[PDB]
Amino acid sequence: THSHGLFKKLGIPGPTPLPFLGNILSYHKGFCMFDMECHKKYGKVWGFYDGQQPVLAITDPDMIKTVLVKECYSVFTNRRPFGPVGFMKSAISIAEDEEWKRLRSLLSPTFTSGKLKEMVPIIAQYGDVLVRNLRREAETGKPVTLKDVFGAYSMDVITSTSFGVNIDSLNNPQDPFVENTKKDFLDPFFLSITVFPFLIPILEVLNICVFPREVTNFLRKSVKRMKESRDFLQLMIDSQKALSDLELVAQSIIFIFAGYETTSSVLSFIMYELATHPDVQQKLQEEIDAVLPNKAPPTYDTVLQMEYLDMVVNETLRLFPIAMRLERVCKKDVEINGMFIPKGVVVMIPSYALHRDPKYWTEPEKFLPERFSKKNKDNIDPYIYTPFGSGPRNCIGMRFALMNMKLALIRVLQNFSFKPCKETQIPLKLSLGGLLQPEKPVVLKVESR
Amino acid sequence: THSHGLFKKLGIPGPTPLPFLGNILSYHKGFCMFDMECHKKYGKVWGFYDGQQPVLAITDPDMIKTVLVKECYSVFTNRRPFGPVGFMKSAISIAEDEEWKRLRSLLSPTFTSGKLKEMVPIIAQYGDVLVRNLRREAETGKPVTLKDVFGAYSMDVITSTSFGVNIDSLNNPQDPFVENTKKDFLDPFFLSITVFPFLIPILEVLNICVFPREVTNFLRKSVKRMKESRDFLQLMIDSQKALSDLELVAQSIIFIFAGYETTSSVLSFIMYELATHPDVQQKLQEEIDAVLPNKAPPTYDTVLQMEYLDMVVNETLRLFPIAMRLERVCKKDVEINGMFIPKGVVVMIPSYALHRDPKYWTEPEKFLPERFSKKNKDNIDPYIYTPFGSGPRNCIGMRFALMNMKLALIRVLQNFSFKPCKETQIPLKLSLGGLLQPEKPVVLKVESR
Numbered sequence A, B: 001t002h003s004h005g006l007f008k009k010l011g012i013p014g015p016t017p018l019p020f021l022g023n024i025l026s027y028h029k030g031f032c033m034f035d036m037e038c039h040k041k042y043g044k045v046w047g048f049y050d051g052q053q054p055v056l057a058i059t060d061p062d063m064i065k066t067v068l069v070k071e072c073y074s075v076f077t078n079r080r081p082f083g084p085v086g087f088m089k090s091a092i093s094i095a096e097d098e099e100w101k102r103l104r105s106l107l108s109p110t111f112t113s114g115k116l117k118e119m120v121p122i123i124a125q126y127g128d129v130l131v132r133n134l135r136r137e138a139e140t141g142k143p144v145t146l147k148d149v150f151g152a153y154s155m156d157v158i159t160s161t162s163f164g165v166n167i168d169s170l171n172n173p174q175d176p177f178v179e180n181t182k183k184d185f186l187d188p189f190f191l192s193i194t195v196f197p198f199l200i201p202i203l204e205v206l207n208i209c210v211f212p213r214e215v216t217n218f219l220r221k222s223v224k225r226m227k228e229s230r231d232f233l234q235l236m237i238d239s240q241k242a243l244s245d246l247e248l249v250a251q252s253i254i255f256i257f258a259g260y261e262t263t264s265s266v267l268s269f270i271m272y273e274l275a276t277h278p279d280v281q282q283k284l285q286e287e288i289d290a291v292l293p294n295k296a297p298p299t300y301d302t303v304l305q306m307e308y309l310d311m312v313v314n315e316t317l318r319l320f321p322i323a324m325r326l327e328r329v330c331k332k333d334v335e336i337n338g339m340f341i342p343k344g345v346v347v348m349i350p351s352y353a354l355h356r357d358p359k360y361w362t363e364p365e366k367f368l369p370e371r372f373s374k375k376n377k378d379n380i381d382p383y384i385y386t387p388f389g390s391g392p393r394n395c396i397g398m399r400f401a402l403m404n405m406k407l408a409l410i411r412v413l414q415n416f417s418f419k420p421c422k423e424t425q426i427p428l429k430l431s432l433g434g435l436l437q438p439e440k441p442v443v444l445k446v447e448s449r
C-alpha cells in the first residue's frame, strides 16, 4: 500500500483503496456491475486499484481512439501482464511489443477475404452435421441445451478450419482430440494473481501454468505429427524471422479457445433473444428464406447480403460483449487529450457498461435490433460499440467469427424454431463471476419446420 | 546453506552437499541407484541433504525396529512433510500425530479377517470379467500390455470394494467415474518442492494442490451422493470424535490410488518374472490346480493354503518394492541404539537397496522364489524385507492387497500362459525416475489353456 496516492494526487476521482487489496472486493457483483456503478457515480473518467496496480477507466470517444488506434504503437502497445504462462509467452494475444508486431504480421494473411471465402465450403459440411444432431433431439420433445450442441459445432468448425481433423464431436464425446479440447478472473486463484503479482515469477520458475502441462504436450506433439504427416495450420507452416516450432504450437492453441467458447457462447446468446423475442425470429427466418429459397445452402456472398442477420448479431454483441472491457498498458509518461498518464498505468475501456449507457442508447437494456438498421446504423459511435476492440490490436479473427456464426444461424433458422421453456431463465441473469456467461445453462424448446 | 555442517559434526559420513541444493543431483540415476551406491560406499550408516533438510539413512535391523516399532509413538511418529495438499491434510498417510492415531483407529476395523473374507465373493465376480477381456485378446494373437488390462481389474476391484460402483472399466474407457480415476518425485516440480519447501506455504494459501481441484470436487459430491443414496464406504459411514464429512471424502481418495496403481503395478511385475522364468510359471500353475481342481473358483481359505503363490508374491516384492524407501520425521533429540539423533532430522530406511544387498541375499538380483520357502523362510530378517513397512505405521491395506493380487493370479494362471515377446524388454530396465515402474510398458504373449 505504498504507491496508492496516485489518484488523489492527479485530482482523478474513484473509490478509496484499502491497503494491499485495492478495489477488488467491489468485484463481488462481477466486473460489469462495478463498471456500471462507477460510470454512473464518477462520470467520464474514474480510477481504481487492482492491488498495487492502478487502472484508469476512460469513456471518451476521441480519447479511446488515441489509445486503441493513434498512439497504439508509441504508448499503449501491450495488454496487462497476464501470467503465469509458460511457453504460451509467444502466443499473440499474450505476446508483447516487437514480438506481437512480428507475429501479427506472420499471422495476418490467414484471415483475408480470399482465405475466408475458401472455408465457406468446409464450414458448410459441418452446419448440416448440426441439423442431424438437432433433429434427433427435436423429434424427442426434450428441451435442448445450446452451449452443448453449439460448442460441438464451433469445435468441429475449429478443428476442420485449422488442422483438417474431422470429428462428430457431439456423438463422439470420448475422443483424445475431444476430451483435451473442451477443458475465470474472479475465482480463488486469480484473485491471488491480481494481488500477489510478485508471486507470478515464483511459478514461471516451476513450469507451472494456467494451461495444464498436459493438454499442451498432447497438442504439441499432435501438431508435430500433423506437421510431419502432411486450414489455419496449412497456412501457418507455409509461413515459417520465421516461426519457431514451439512458437507455432502456441499460436494454434489460442485460435482454438478463441473460436470455441466465443462462437459457442455468442450463438447461445443469440438464440435466447430470438426465442424470447418471437417476432424477431420471425422477421429473420423470412429474410433468410428470401436470399436462400427452398432452404438453399448459404454462400459467402449471400451471407454478407443478409443485413437483418448482421443487425441481429450486433445487438446481441451489444447486450453481451464477451470482452466486457478492453485494456492496454501505457509505457510512457505521455499526456493524451489533456490528461497526464504516468508510465506503468493500465488503461481500461469498459465495454459492457458503455454498451448499456442510456446517454448513447435509448431503452438500453431492451433488445431492439433496429438500432443497427442501415437507417440508424450511422448514429453509432464506432468507439462506443467495440465488440472486437478497435485498431491495430483489435480482434484478429473478427471476419471469421462473424462469418462462422452466421453460417450456423442460417443453417439453423431455415429448419427449426425456438420457444421458451418453463425452466428457461426469463429474463436471463448474467454471471456474478468474471466472464460473459449465463447463470443457468441456456434451455429452450426446439420445433422442426 | 546454513545448517549444513550437521553431518561433518556428528562424525557421520556421506557425500558432500553443495550450497542450496544438497545431494539432489545424485538423483539423476533415481533413488535406488543412489541408495545402492551409498550403502556400498559408506556402509551401515550414512547421511545426505535433501536441500536444507538432513536425512539419515539407517540399515541396522535393531535400529530399524526402534524407529518403526518401539519409539514410533514417542519420537518417530510422522512422515516427511509432504505438500501442498489442500484438504487432503486429513488423509491418514499424510495426517500427523494425534490425527493419525485418531484416524488409524476409526479406519482399522475395515481390514479385518472377517471383513476381508466378506469381499472374497465380490472380488470374485470381477476376476472373471478379466478373463473375458483377456480371451478376446488371447484369441487375437496380438501382444498384451499388462498395466492396461491389470489396472482395469484393480480399478474395478477398488470401486466395488469401496462404493459398490460396478463398471467394466476396460470396455468402458469413457465413463465419468473412469476418466477421473485413472488420472513422480523427480520431475521439474517436485525437485523444486524439495528445494523450495518455503514455497509450499505460498501454495496452500492459493487452494493449489498436487491433486487437481476437479477430481476431488467430482468425488467430493459423488460420495455425498452415495452418502445420501444409501464396501469401504459402507464401513466408513457407519464409523462416523466422529468423521467430518470432508474428512471421510479424503480417506476414500487415498484408498483408491493406494490400490489402483500398486495392485496393477505389482501384478505387472509378477507376470514379467513368470514369463521370463517359464519353469516357475509351470510350478505355480501346478500348485494352483492342486488346491483348485477343474479350474475351481478360489476361496479365502484356499488362497492362504497356496504357499508357492505367497513365495512368488514376496520374491517379486523383494525385487520391486514399490515403497523404495521408508521414512519418518524424528521429533525429539533422542539418542537411539547409541547414536544421537537431533530433532527435525528425517530418518530413512532404503528398502530397495536393502532388498538387493549380497550381505543378506545370495545371488541378490536373480529371481529365486525359494528364498521364501517354509524351509528357508526363517533366515529372513523381518526388518530387512519390509515391503509393507513395519509396525504401528505400516501399510494399513496389506491383507487386502495381498489377497486382492492372489485372487487375480489364481484366476489368471488357471487359464492363460505368458510367453516373452521380441519387444519384451529382457532383462527389464527400471525407471531413472522416482517410483517403481518399468522403462517400457510391459509387453507379453498370452496363450489360452
Ligand code: HEM
Pocket: A068, A092, A093, A094, A104, A254, A255, A256, A258, A259, A260, A262, A263, A266, A322, A323, A326, A327, A386, A387, A388, A389, A390, A392, A393, A394, A395, A396, A397, A398, A400, A401, A402
Ligand atoms: C464472437 C467472436 C469474437 C469476439 C466478440 C472477439 C472479441 C475480441 C476482442 C474484444 C479482442 C481484443 C481487442 C482489443 O484488445 O481491442 C480480441 C482479440 C483477439 N481475438 Fe477475438 N473475438 C472473437 C473471436 C475470435 C476468433 C474466432 C478468433 C480466431 C482466431 C479470435 C482471435 C483473436 C486474437 C488472436 C486476439 C488477440 C489479437 C491481438 O492481441 O493482437 N477471436 N477478440
Ligand code: HEM
Pocket: B068, B092, B093, B094, B104, B254, B255, B256, B258, B259, B260, B262, B263, B266, B322, B323, B326, B327, B386, B387, B388, B389, B390, B392, B393, B394, B395, B396, B397, B398, B400, B401, B402
Ligand atoms: C502391493 C500393495 C502394497 C504395498 C507393497 C504397500 C506398501 C506400503 C508401505 C511400504 C507403506 C508405508 C509403511 C511404512 O511407512 O512403514 C504403506 C502405507 C499405506 N498403505 Fe500400503 N501398500 C500396498 C497397498 C495398499 C492398499 C491396497 C491400500 C488400500 C487401502 C493401502 C493403504 C495404505 C495406507 C493408508 C498407508 C498409510 C498408512 C499410515 O500411514 O498409517 N496400501 N503401504
Ligand SMILES: CC(C)(C)OC(=O)N[C@H](CS[C@H](Cc1ccccc1)C(=O)NCCc1cccnc1)Cc1cccc2ccccc12
Pocket: A079, A080, A081, A082, A091, A093, A094, A185, A253, A254, A257, A258, A259, A262, A322, A323, A324, A325, A326, A327, A395
Ligand atoms: C487484463 C487481465 C489480466 C484482467 O486479463 C488478461 O490479460 N487476459 C487476456 C490476455 S491472454 C487471454 C487468456 C487465455 C488464453 C488461452 C485460453 C484461455 C484464455 C487470451 O489470449 N485470449 C485469446 C482468445 C480470445 C478471447 C476473447 C476473444 N477473442 C479471442 C486479454 C485478452 C486477450 C485477447 C482477447 C481478449 C478479448 C476480451 C478481453 C480480453 C482479451
Ligand SMILES: CC(C)(C)OC(=O)N[C@H](CS[C@H](Cc1ccccc1)C(=O)NCCc1cccnc1)Cc1cccc2ccccc12
Pocket: B079, B080, B081, B082, B091, B093, B094, B185, B253, B254, B257, B258, B259, B262, B322, B323, B324, B325, B326, B327, B395
Ligand atoms: C517423503 C517424501 C516427501 C519423499 O514423500 C512423501 O511424503 N510421500 C508419501 C506421503 S503422502 C502419499 C502421496 C499420494 C497420495 C494420493 C495419491 C498419490 C500419491 C500417499 O498418501 N500414498 C498413499 C497410497 C499408498 C502408496 C503406496 C503404498 N500403499 C499405499 C509417503 C508414503 C505414504 C503412504 C505409503 C507410502 C509407501 C511407500 C513410500 C511412501 C509412502
